[PDB]
C-alpha cells in the first residue's frame, strides 16, 4: 500500500490528528447517557457528562465533517470502562467523563458505547481513511483513599468483569502505597501517587501481565495509534518493555505525554523520547508557537531556535506530536488573541515537521481558559470559518508533498515579525513565509529558496493574504508579504533514487516487521541494510516505491542505521534503529552499601546491549534511584532487559568523567523468561 494509506499503522507524519474529548463532541446516542447527577443535558457544567459517544463520531464521519476538514486520524479518549461512581471534591461533583479514572481496561465505557459500537467506529473510520488513535493511561486506576473505602470505588481494578483488587487491603501489592508525589524528584513522581490517583506497582507480575494483555486486546481490535498518558510517572524500563511487547504484536504508532512548560530542553524528556521506543508530545514546539503568536512574549528567532534545538536533541524529531493548544492548557484563542494569529499558528503547525494534532473545536475558534473550560462542548459543525478553510488546504499537503511529511527545515529569511522557512525531501520542496505583524507588511528582498525556476502560486489562495512568487533558480523576486500574511509555495516531482523518509517503529528485536517509508525505492524488490547486514528475498515482506515492509534480521543487539538499495544506488541512512536482544522483561536492580560522595552517582552496565555492553557512556543505566522504593545507601533501578538470558553486570560510581567500578567478580543473574523480577546485590 502506499505510505500514505490508512493501512500504515507505523507512521503518522503524513497525517493530521484531530484530538477529541469524546464526551464533548456529539451525542449520537442518548440511550447511553448517564442517569442522574452525573449527567448534564445542556453541558453547561463541564465536570459532568454531556452525552458524547462513538455513534456521534460515526455520524460526523459519515456526513464528511472530518473529510471536508481533511483530518486523517481521530485521537479519542481512553475507551476502557471507568469508575461508575461520582466524586465531589469540596462541594463539587466530578465524573469520569475524561476517561482517566479506569477500573477495567478490558470492557468499554458504556457512556461511549459497546464493543460492537467500537468495532463499528474502527470500521467506519478506516472506510474513509481516518485512523483511530486512543488514550491509554497504564499509570493508575481512579482516585482512592486508603483509610476510606467509601470514597469513590477505592480504585478497585477489575479484569474483564473479575475484580483483581482495591487500594485498601491490597495485600498483593498491586498499587504503590508510598503516599503522594510532592513532585520534588523524578523518582518521587514515578513511585508515588499522582494527586490521589491509585498508583500501580508494575513490578508486580499480575499488573505487568495485565497491561500487556489489555493493550493486546485493543490492538487486536483495530487501533492504529496509542497515546500513553503520564509517562513521566512510570518507570522507563517498564514502558520500554511494554513497548517491545506491543511492537511484537501489531506495531502501532505510539507517543506519550511528558509535560514541559517551555521550548527549553530537558534531558530527562529528551532521553525518554530517545530510549523508550516511543515518542512525545512536542511541548517545546508548542510553547515556541504560543510565545510568538499567542502571547507576544518572543519573536521569530525564538521559533527558529526551537526548530533547531529540538532537531538536535530528539533522534526522530518527525515523530514528535505538535499542537497549538490541548486539554493541558488555555485555549489558544482568547478575547485578546485574534484569529489571524490562531490561523497562523495552525498554518505553521500543519506545515512544520512532526505529527500535528488539532484539539477539537479549534476550527470553530472555541475559547475556554483552564480546566474544564478548555473542555467545552462542541459549539458548531460549520465549514465556513477561516480556520476550517486553512486546514483543508494545508493538511492534504502532508499526504501529497513529502517535504512536509519527511523533509528537513531550513530558514531562508527571518526577522522579528517575519519568518520564511523551507521544507525539503529529495527533489520535493515547500516554502512558507509568515508575517505576524497585523499592521505592517514586509518588503522581502534577496530571498533564496530551492524552488526550481518557475512562477509559483500560494497554496492557500490568498485566504491568509498570501501572494504569488516567481523563482529564477531559487531566486525569488522582491515581494511584499502583507500584514498578517502567510503564503505557502511548494514543488513536488517524481523521485528517481531511493530516499528514506521514515522507519517505523525504530526499536525492536530480530523477527519483528518494520515499515520503511520514502520515495524512489522502485517496484522491483531490492535490499535493506541494518548496518552492514543485507536483508533480502522473503525477509522483505513487501516492496514498493513509497514503502517497504522488512523483517529485523538476526544481528547483534545494538544501535544500527537502515539503508536501502534500489538498483545498486543506496539511499541515505535512517540512523538510530535500535535492535534488541529479544523479548524483554523488567528487572529491579538493588545494590546495597553504595556510599557515594557529594555529587556522585551509580550506574548499571552489563554484557548485553540492554545494559549498555559494558559502557560508562550514555548507554549505561542510571543514575539509580535511592528514596522511595529503597533508600540510600541502597540504590535501585527498573530496567528492560532480555528475557531468559544469563546477565553479567556491575555497578559503578561516576562524579566527573572519573569512574569507579565495583570490585571482584561481575554479579550474575539469569533473567526470568517473562514478566518482572527483583535482584539484590551488595556493592563489591
Ligand atoms: Ca450518549
Ligand atoms: Ca506511577
XYZ file of C-alpha atoms and ligand atoms in Angstrom:
686
model
C 0.000 0.000 0.000
C 1.361 3.477 -0.398
C 2.931 5.036 2.765
C 0.009 7.489 2.735
C -2.649 4.751 3.085
C -4.622 4.463 6.300
C -3.080 0.980 6.459
C 0.234 2.445 7.640
C -0.154 1.996 11.439
C 3.563 2.628 11.862
C 3.731 6.279 10.715
C 1.509 9.360 11.169
C 3.867 12.058 9.710
C 1.624 12.291 6.663
C -1.329 12.622 8.992
C -3.304 15.305 10.740
C -4.724 14.161 14.072
C -7.990 15.573 15.350
C -7.755 15.329 19.165
C -11.199 14.906 20.637
C -12.651 14.608 24.140
C -15.344 12.063 23.127
C -17.930 13.190 25.721
C -17.732 16.770 24.492
C -18.272 16.400 20.734
C -21.580 14.839 19.608
C -24.135 12.707 21.487
C -25.114 10.289 18.709
C -26.772 8.004 21.214
C -28.858 9.337 24.160
C -29.693 5.793 25.310
C -26.185 5.543 26.669
C -26.220 8.821 28.577
C -25.634 8.785 32.349
C -28.616 8.888 34.635
C -28.952 11.470 37.398
C -26.367 13.886 38.769
C -23.625 12.603 36.520
C -25.492 13.958 33.505
C -25.981 17.440 32.116
C -28.162 17.777 29.032
C -27.113 21.405 28.409
C -23.500 20.507 29.310
C -23.431 23.895 30.987
C -21.498 22.134 33.767
C -18.293 20.667 32.399
C -17.403 18.464 35.398
C -20.404 16.473 34.228
C -21.182 14.112 31.369
C -22.682 15.799 28.381
C -23.644 12.688 26.431
C -20.988 12.274 23.716
C -20.287 8.814 22.303
C -18.879 6.769 19.441
C -22.046 6.834 17.328
C -21.747 10.616 17.279
C -18.259 10.413 15.860
C -19.521 7.802 13.387
C -22.057 10.404 12.451
C -19.635 13.264 11.813
C -17.547 10.761 9.876
C -20.413 9.929 7.569
C -21.580 13.449 6.801
C -17.955 14.168 5.872
C -17.307 16.792 8.565
C -13.829 15.350 9.154
C -13.184 14.586 5.452
C -14.068 18.164 4.453
C -11.693 19.311 7.178
C -9.065 16.891 5.889
C -8.020 15.311 9.191
C -6.608 11.823 8.631
C -6.797 10.400 12.182
C -9.012 10.713 15.247
C -7.469 10.759 18.728
C -10.242 9.796 21.181
C -10.434 9.478 24.984
C -9.495 6.108 26.616
C -12.198 3.548 25.599
C -11.794 1.359 28.714
C -14.505 1.094 31.409
C -14.149 3.925 34.005
C -15.467 4.104 37.606
C -19.231 4.474 37.723
C -19.253 6.417 40.999
C -19.349 10.167 41.273
C -16.837 12.137 43.348
C -17.477 15.515 44.943
C -14.254 17.483 45.572
C -15.212 20.003 48.270
C -18.678 20.999 47.112
C -18.243 19.918 43.537
C -19.423 16.631 41.975
C -16.939 15.250 39.446
C -17.336 12.451 36.941
C -15.016 10.260 34.899
C -16.077 11.932 31.626
C -12.407 12.343 30.643
C -11.949 8.581 30.807
C -8.879 8.878 33.088
C -10.394 7.011 36.066
C -10.342 3.456 34.748
C -11.465 0.373 36.624
C -11.494 -2.146 33.789
C -9.242 -1.909 30.702
C -10.956 -4.890 29.114
C -14.517 -3.544 28.927
C -15.728 -0.400 27.158
C -17.072 2.775 28.771
C -20.846 2.276 28.252
C -21.388 6.035 28.122
C -19.291 5.952 24.909
C -20.848 2.718 23.621
C -20.375 -1.014 23.207
C -17.754 -3.375 21.837
C -19.782 -3.623 18.666
C -20.020 0.193 18.639
C -16.286 0.488 18.990
C -15.672 -2.129 16.331
C -18.311 -0.202 14.452
C -16.309 3.054 14.822
C -12.994 1.445 13.781
C -14.703 0.218 10.619
C -16.360 3.468 9.562
C -13.081 5.348 10.151
C -10.883 3.089 8.004
C -13.669 3.041 5.488
C -12.788 6.713 4.935
C -9.061 6.718 5.645
C -9.395 8.134 9.134
C -7.064 6.409 11.515
C -8.076 5.845 15.138
C -5.625 6.673 17.896
C -6.664 6.076 21.553
C -5.529 7.108 25.018
C -4.248 4.543 27.410
C -3.021 5.557 30.823
C -1.445 2.424 32.470
C -0.147 4.514 35.382
C -3.142 4.268 37.710
C -6.829 3.486 38.287
C -9.239 6.023 39.884
C -8.954 8.322 42.933
C -8.671 6.273 46.143
C -8.447 6.985 49.868
C -6.870 4.052 51.660
C -8.240 4.813 55.129
C -11.577 5.225 53.455
C -13.092 2.586 51.216
C -16.329 4.548 50.840
C -14.514 7.152 48.802
C -15.010 6.621 45.023
C -14.526 2.941 44.184
C -11.408 2.553 46.311
C -9.554 2.412 42.987
C -10.703 -1.222 42.530
C -9.303 -2.716 39.364
C -11.215 -5.375 37.501
C -10.115 -7.707 34.787
C -12.946 -8.168 32.275
C -15.548 -8.453 34.990
C -13.483 -10.195 37.642
C -12.057 -7.903 40.342
C -8.335 -8.032 40.971
C -8.072 -5.606 43.925
C -8.662 -2.217 45.513
C -6.376 0.359 47.154
C -7.156 -0.628 50.711
C -6.315 -4.184 51.800
C -4.047 -4.575 48.775
C -2.171 -7.481 50.320
C -0.536 -8.466 46.995
C 0.987 -5.076 46.349
C -0.693 -4.105 43.077
C -0.656 -0.434 43.884
C 2.057 1.598 45.448
C 1.348 2.800 48.934
C 4.078 5.463 49.277
C 1.719 8.392 49.617
C 1.675 11.197 47.077
C 4.140 12.840 44.822
C 5.227 16.198 46.145
C 6.891 16.487 42.720
C 10.353 17.296 44.041
C 12.141 14.469 42.129
C 11.591 12.170 39.065
C 11.508 9.233 41.468
C 9.051 10.983 43.835
C 6.837 11.448 40.783
C 7.138 7.952 39.350
C 6.763 5.860 42.522
C 4.201 7.926 44.339
C 0.506 8.643 43.867
C -0.300 11.410 41.388
C -2.610 13.590 43.451
C -4.821 10.809 44.900
C -4.699 8.543 41.920
C -4.148 4.906 42.860
C -0.577 4.193 41.673
C 0.063 0.782 40.114
C 3.139 -1.266 41.008
C 4.250 -2.516 37.616
C 6.958 -4.553 39.309
C 4.085 -6.773 40.316
C 3.788 -9.503 37.666
C -0.019 -9.728 37.579
C -0.168 -5.978 36.830
C 2.715 -6.327 34.278
C 0.948 -9.178 32.530
C -2.498 -7.469 32.815
C -1.489 -4.405 30.803
C 0.278 -6.500 28.140
C -2.957 -8.445 27.703
C -5.142 -5.354 27.824
C -3.390 -3.374 25.094
C -3.141 -6.549 23.000
C -6.919 -6.617 23.011
C -7.418 -3.037 21.750
C -4.663 -3.509 19.125
C -6.188 -6.834 18.045
C -9.362 -4.770 17.536
C -8.012 -2.176 15.136
C -6.335 0.776 16.878
C -3.699 2.486 14.758
C -2.025 4.539 17.415
C -1.811 4.712 21.176
C -1.295 7.840 23.241
C 0.199 6.897 26.602
C -0.590 9.235 29.500
C 1.585 10.206 32.468
C 4.756 8.599 31.071
C 6.824 10.782 33.330
C 5.335 8.908 36.268
C 6.063 5.290 35.351
C 9.485 3.697 35.005
C 11.136 3.930 31.586
C 12.279 0.311 31.852
C 8.710 -0.900 32.331
C 7.381 1.182 29.464
C 10.155 0.294 27.052
C 9.343 -3.358 27.868
C 5.624 -2.752 27.450
C 6.614 -1.235 24.116
C 8.709 -4.127 22.833
C 5.670 -6.246 23.682
C 3.461 -4.094 21.581
C 5.836 -3.956 18.612
C 5.951 -7.731 18.653
C 2.186 -7.984 18.296
C 0.936 -5.269 15.941
C 3.383 -2.369 15.923
C 1.356 0.827 16.020
C 2.400 4.460 16.287
C 2.735 5.319 19.998
C 3.522 8.580 21.730
C 3.363 9.850 25.245
C 2.739 12.858 27.452
C 5.754 14.277 29.349
C 4.876 17.835 30.303
C 7.334 20.685 29.758
C 6.453 24.356 30.069
C 8.886 25.991 27.726
C 10.678 25.430 24.472
C 13.772 24.718 26.633
C 15.396 21.271 26.599
C 15.069 18.861 29.441
C 17.488 15.961 29.358
C 15.005 13.606 31.035
C 12.432 14.423 28.378
C 14.957 14.115 25.545
C 16.320 10.857 26.982
C 12.874 9.442 27.351
C 11.848 10.144 23.786
C 15.165 8.616 22.694
C 15.374 5.407 24.796
C 11.714 4.431 25.460
C 10.858 3.205 21.980
C 8.009 5.757 21.799
C 7.809 9.492 21.027
C 6.487 12.538 22.886
C 4.047 15.445 22.508
C 6.300 18.272 21.389
C 5.650 20.665 24.334
C 8.696 22.760 23.361
C 7.336 23.304 19.784
C 4.001 24.157 21.342
C 5.485 26.744 23.707
C 7.540 28.292 20.892
C 4.425 28.577 18.730
C 2.495 30.250 21.601
C 5.032 32.803 22.826
C 5.440 34.036 19.305
C 1.892 34.012 18.012
C -0.311 33.977 21.064
C 1.457 35.732 23.862
C 3.802 38.092 22.134
C 6.483 37.123 24.608
C 9.060 36.025 21.996
C 9.889 36.739 18.333
C 10.654 34.692 15.174
C 14.193 33.850 16.261
C 12.807 32.015 19.276
C 10.788 29.928 16.872
C 13.747 29.172 14.547
C 15.891 28.181 17.532
C 13.262 25.792 18.936
C 13.178 24.255 15.465
C 16.916 23.520 15.523
C 17.487 22.902 19.157
C 14.775 20.233 19.027
C 16.177 18.549 15.939
C 19.476 18.131 17.816
C 18.012 16.618 20.955
C 15.469 14.315 19.541
C 16.614 11.407 17.438
C 13.407 11.213 15.365
C 12.083 14.740 15.558
C 9.466 13.676 12.902
C 7.661 11.533 15.424
C 7.046 14.267 17.993
C 3.438 15.325 18.072
C 2.785 19.081 17.725
C -0.074 21.374 18.593
C -1.207 24.926 19.386
C -3.397 24.040 22.359
C -4.771 20.974 24.132
C -6.538 19.640 27.254
C -3.472 20.683 29.359
C -3.826 24.421 28.758
C -5.764 27.506 27.970
C -7.425 27.539 24.569
C -5.179 29.393 22.170
C -7.943 31.720 21.107
C -8.883 34.311 23.735
C -10.538 37.772 23.563
C -7.082 39.437 23.384
C -5.771 36.880 20.858
C -7.007 37.423 17.299
C -7.953 34.985 14.563
C -5.246 35.561 12.040
C -2.793 34.503 14.819
C -4.755 31.306 15.529
C -4.840 30.695 11.762
C -1.126 31.480 11.554
C -0.179 29.033 14.328
C -2.297 26.452 12.547
C -0.665 27.028 9.165
C 2.696 26.805 10.889
C 1.860 23.579 12.735
C 0.254 21.983 9.703
C 3.372 22.555 7.545
C 6.173 22.013 10.083
C 7.925 18.736 10.993
C 6.409 16.062 13.237
C 2.898 14.743 13.581
C 0.443 17.615 14.069
C -2.750 17.398 16.167
C -5.707 19.802 16.409
C -7.761 19.947 19.591
C -11.426 19.646 18.570
C -13.221 22.976 18.347
C -10.231 24.924 17.005
C -11.781 25.263 13.514
C -14.767 26.798 15.309
C -12.488 29.195 17.212
C -13.558 27.751 20.542
C -12.295 29.502 23.662
C -12.057 28.290 27.265
C -9.178 29.045 29.665
C -8.364 26.300 32.178
C -9.898 23.005 33.250
C -12.570 22.121 32.381
C -13.165 25.365 30.418
C -10.745 24.024 27.815
C -13.136 21.048 27.527
C -16.229 22.975 26.470
C -18.896 21.270 24.308
C -18.553 21.204 20.532
C -20.281 24.559 19.512
C -20.823 24.044 15.725
C -20.140 21.965 12.654
C -19.947 24.744 10.110
C -17.375 24.534 7.376
C -17.284 28.349 6.949
C -14.625 29.524 9.408
C -11.336 30.794 8.009
C -9.634 28.351 10.381
C -11.617 25.461 8.891
C -10.587 26.623 5.414
C -6.851 26.744 6.136
C -6.796 23.190 7.455
C -8.462 21.679 4.392
C -5.956 23.353 2.101
C -2.811 22.646 4.149
C -3.441 19.149 5.565
C -3.559 17.165 2.298
C -0.085 18.583 1.602
C 1.240 16.156 4.222
C -0.035 13.353 2.053
C 0.833 14.897 -1.350
C 4.139 16.759 -0.739
C 6.760 14.596 1.104
C 8.860 17.606 2.034
C 6.114 18.321 4.609
C 5.896 14.660 5.624
C 9.621 13.813 5.917
C 11.534 16.919 4.937
C 14.173 18.935 6.765
C 13.598 22.540 7.771
C 15.940 25.469 6.994
C 15.412 29.255 7.253
C 15.743 31.384 4.120
C 14.620 34.605 5.734
C 13.907 35.881 9.217
C 13.491 38.968 11.388
C 11.397 39.677 14.471
C 7.938 39.603 12.859
C 8.722 37.669 9.704
C 9.772 34.119 9.051
C 10.401 32.314 5.777
C 11.437 28.672 6.101
C 11.862 25.787 3.731
C 10.986 22.103 3.835
C 12.795 19.738 1.505
C 12.843 15.970 0.956
C 14.780 14.808 -2.071
C 13.690 16.750 -5.125
C 10.450 17.928 -3.442
C 10.221 21.321 -1.708
C 7.835 23.616 0.195
C 8.333 27.213 1.341
C 6.268 29.076 3.944
C 6.521 32.821 4.599
C 4.918 34.250 7.750
C 4.325 37.833 8.786
C 2.809 38.056 12.229
C 2.635 41.809 12.098
C -1.020 42.758 11.862
C -0.441 46.386 10.873
C 2.606 46.423 8.624
C 3.702 44.485 5.565
C 7.295 43.492 4.707
C 9.444 44.135 1.721
C 11.177 40.784 1.373
C 14.198 41.207 -0.902
C 17.010 38.735 -1.644
C 15.052 35.603 -0.718
C 16.531 32.330 -1.933
C 14.791 29.018 -1.958
C 15.420 25.739 -3.726
C 12.282 26.084 -5.797
C 13.224 25.300 -9.450
C 12.710 28.205 -11.895
C 9.017 28.896 -12.208
C 6.031 31.101 -11.486
C 4.786 29.908 -8.069
C 1.200 30.062 -6.684
C 0.061 30.418 -2.984
C -1.389 27.069 -1.945
C -3.809 28.957 0.335
C -5.291 31.054 -2.486
C -4.708 34.241 -0.534
C -7.164 33.283 2.219
C -4.409 34.175 4.653
C -3.234 37.031 2.443
C -0.715 35.021 0.536
C 0.742 36.200 -2.741
C 2.369 34.719 -5.777
C 6.069 34.483 -6.409
C 8.351 33.666 -9.322
C 11.555 31.694 -8.842
C 14.559 32.046 -11.066
C 16.619 29.085 -9.775
C 15.836 29.585 -6.126
C 15.942 33.334 -6.581
C 12.532 34.676 -5.589
C 11.962 38.175 -6.811
C 11.384 41.097 -4.429
C 7.866 40.900 -2.998
C 5.693 42.231 -0.299
C 4.365 39.990 2.481
C 1.177 41.692 3.567
C 0.077 42.328 7.145
C -0.661 39.075 8.941
C 0.002 37.466 5.582
C 1.104 33.883 5.096
C 1.820 32.055 1.853
C 2.883 28.524 1.066
C 4.676 27.721 -2.205
C 5.714 24.126 -2.874
C 7.228 21.887 -5.550
C 6.635 18.149 -5.996
C 8.153 15.808 -8.565
C 8.892 12.093 -9.009
C 11.793 10.638 -7.051
C 14.307 8.641 -9.103
C 16.766 7.395 -6.446
C 15.712 5.651 -3.236
C 15.359 8.063 -0.348
C 14.151 7.102 3.174
C 11.573 9.369 4.839
C 10.655 7.100 7.757
C 11.328 3.805 9.553
C 8.513 2.617 11.816
C 8.888 1.642 14.643
C 12.584 2.328 15.333
C 13.223 -0.274 18.014
C 12.620 -3.990 18.222
C 14.286 -7.391 18.191
C 15.087 -9.777 15.328
C 11.886 -11.241 13.916
C 9.757 -8.090 14.046
C 8.387 -6.285 10.927
C 9.313 -2.641 10.389
C 7.959 -0.098 7.885
C 10.305 1.912 5.702
C 8.646 4.912 4.093
C 10.212 7.079 1.484
C 10.298 7.518 -2.251
C 12.146 6.041 -5.205
C 12.645 2.597 -3.733
C 11.283 1.343 -7.020
C 8.980 -1.612 -7.613
C 11.493 -4.376 -8.184
C 12.378 -5.689 -4.733
C 15.844 -4.668 -3.685
C 17.743 -4.989 -0.432
C 17.693 -3.414 3.019
C 20.577 -2.816 5.355
C 20.778 -2.886 9.092
C 24.306 -1.633 9.283
C 26.308 -3.933 7.015
C 23.739 -6.663 7.139
C 21.793 -7.210 3.941
C 18.193 -8.285 4.242
C 16.828 -9.848 1.089
C 14.245 -12.012 -0.548
C 11.341 -13.224 1.569
C 12.718 -11.279 4.533
C 11.497 -8.215 2.676
C 7.833 -8.981 3.327
C 6.827 -6.123 0.939
C 8.387 -3.689 -1.526
C 7.183 -0.649 -3.458
C 8.374 2.876 -4.195
C 6.895 4.584 -1.154
C 7.107 1.826 1.441
C 8.988 -1.382 2.227
C 7.964 -3.892 4.888
C 11.073 -5.707 6.092
C 11.970 -8.144 8.866
C 14.518 -7.258 11.572
C 17.448 -9.590 10.767
C 19.019 -11.737 13.471
C 22.046 -9.497 14.135
C 23.897 -8.410 17.259
C 21.837 -6.233 19.612
C 22.886 -2.591 19.282
C 22.158 0.757 17.597
C 22.010 0.463 13.786
C 21.367 2.556 10.653
C 18.940 1.497 7.979
C 19.993 1.893 4.384
C 18.031 0.737 1.373
C 19.362 -0.068 -2.108
C 17.176 0.360 -5.167
C 19.279 -0.676 -8.146
C 22.738 -0.554 -6.542
C 22.075 3.062 -5.584
C 21.978 3.082 -1.826
C 19.649 5.651 -0.238
C 20.555 7.837 2.731
C 20.606 6.219 6.212
C 17.869 6.350 8.836
C 20.230 6.349 11.755
C 19.359 5.039 15.196
C 17.417 1.917 14.652
C 17.614 0.079 17.984
C 17.841 -3.713 17.649
C 17.086 -5.586 20.855
C 18.437 -8.916 22.076
C 14.954 -10.375 22.027
C 11.948 -10.364 24.324
C 12.201 -8.080 27.315
C 11.168 -8.398 30.956
C 11.518 -5.818 33.713
C 14.147 -6.408 36.459
C 14.540 -4.139 39.523
C 18.163 -3.892 40.474
C 19.074 -3.331 44.064
C 22.587 -2.694 45.313
C 23.404 -2.121 48.971
C 26.152 -0.226 50.735
C 26.700 2.012 47.759
C 28.039 5.079 49.580
C 28.558 7.961 47.189
C 30.348 11.221 47.678
C 28.643 14.611 47.255
C 27.613 14.730 43.660
C 28.443 11.129 42.925
C 26.108 8.564 41.228
C 25.588 4.887 40.430
C 25.009 3.358 37.030
C 24.320 -0.098 35.738
C 26.101 -1.840 32.902
C 26.438 -5.427 31.725
C 27.206 -7.929 28.958
C 24.158 -7.215 26.766
C 23.114 -4.158 24.783
C 20.102 -3.554 27.028
C 22.620 -2.835 29.832
C 24.973 -0.917 27.524
C 27.522 -3.559 26.669
C 29.946 -2.618 29.444
C 29.912 1.136 28.938
C 30.079 4.101 31.215
C 28.522 6.214 28.486
C 25.052 7.428 27.696
C 24.352 3.783 27.016
C 24.775 2.898 30.714
C 21.778 2.575 33.029
C 21.124 5.150 35.706
C 21.578 7.340 37.568
C 19.944 4.913 40.000
C 17.233 5.979 42.452
C 17.532 5.962 46.289
C 14.492 7.494 48.037
C 11.057 5.991 47.585
C 11.150 2.268 46.986
C 14.619 1.881 48.597
C 16.809 4.469 50.307
C 20.469 5.459 50.397
C 22.907 3.776 50.566
C 20.671 1.274 48.861
C 20.017 2.170 45.248
C 17.614 0.642 42.795
C 16.549 0.849 39.190
C 13.968 -0.874 36.972
C 15.458 -1.960 33.635
C 14.032 -3.545 30.446
C 16.453 -6.378 29.627
C 16.388 -9.668 27.592
C 14.274 -12.484 28.961
C 15.701 -15.906 29.847
C 19.294 -14.714 29.409
C 22.320 -15.001 31.702
C 23.424 -11.483 32.513
C 26.645 -10.209 33.993
C 26.576 -6.715 35.384
C 28.464 -4.425 37.686
C 27.687 -1.074 39.246
C 29.898 1.989 39.008
C 30.111 5.429 40.595
C 30.750 8.437 38.346
C 31.120 12.046 39.561
C 33.204 13.756 36.911
C 34.468 11.738 33.979
C 36.147 9.689 36.726
C 34.530 6.272 37.038
C 34.948 3.838 39.908
C 33.893 0.239 39.424
C 32.711 -2.445 41.837
C 35.446 -4.859 42.786
C 35.719 -8.604 42.412
C 33.640 -10.678 40.053
C 30.764 -9.444 37.925
C 27.420 -10.121 39.529
C 25.313 -12.546 37.571
C 21.605 -13.192 37.188
C 19.534 -15.382 34.910
C 16.544 -13.218 33.932
C 13.012 -14.572 34.050
C 11.670 -15.664 30.674
C 8.639 -13.402 31.230
C 7.102 -10.747 33.439
C 9.120 -8.993 36.112
C 11.728 -9.720 38.821
C 13.982 -8.267 41.555
C 17.727 -8.857 42.104
C 19.615 -7.639 45.170
C 23.375 -7.436 45.434
C 25.989 -5.742 47.623
C 28.416 -3.128 46.481
C 31.662 -5.035 45.959
Ca -24.504 9.397 24.869
Ca 3.209 5.719 38.963
